[PDB]
Design goal:
This is part of a larger assembly, with 2 copies of chain A.
Chain A (H helix, E strand, L loop, with lengths): L8 E2 L44
C-alpha cells in the first residue's frame, strides 16, 4: 500500500493539565501582610490573664 | 367446505426492526474531524508542568 504518501496529523493545541482548584489562601487570615511588607519575621504576642484569687 | 377458494392475505408493508437508540456519538468530543480529513493518525500533545524549586 502507500507507505510514504499517507500523512499523520498533529493537533495545534496542547492539552492543559487538569489541576486542583486552590482555595486555602482566601480562607486563612491575611491581616499581617501590611506589617510584613519588610523583614523576615513577625512577632505576634497574646495576653496571659491574671489569676482570680480566693 | 371451501378447501380451495378462501384466500390467505399478505400485508404489503414490512415491520421495521425495533432498535436501541444511539447516543454515544453525540456525547463524545468531535473536534479532530476538522484535521482528520486525511491520514490515519492524529497526534495529540499535552503540557508537562515546570517543577517548583526550593
Amino acid at each position: 500500500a502507500f507507505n510514504n504518501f499517507i500523512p499523520e496529523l498533529w493537533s495545534d493545541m496542547l492539552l492543559e493539565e487538569w489541576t486542583a482548584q486552590t482555595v486555602f489562601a482566601n480562607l486563612v487570615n491575611r491581616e499581617y501582610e501590611g506589617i510584613a511588607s519588610k523583614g523576615n519575621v513577625v512577632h505576634i504576642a497574646g495576653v496571659v490573664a491574671p489569676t482570680v484569687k480566693d
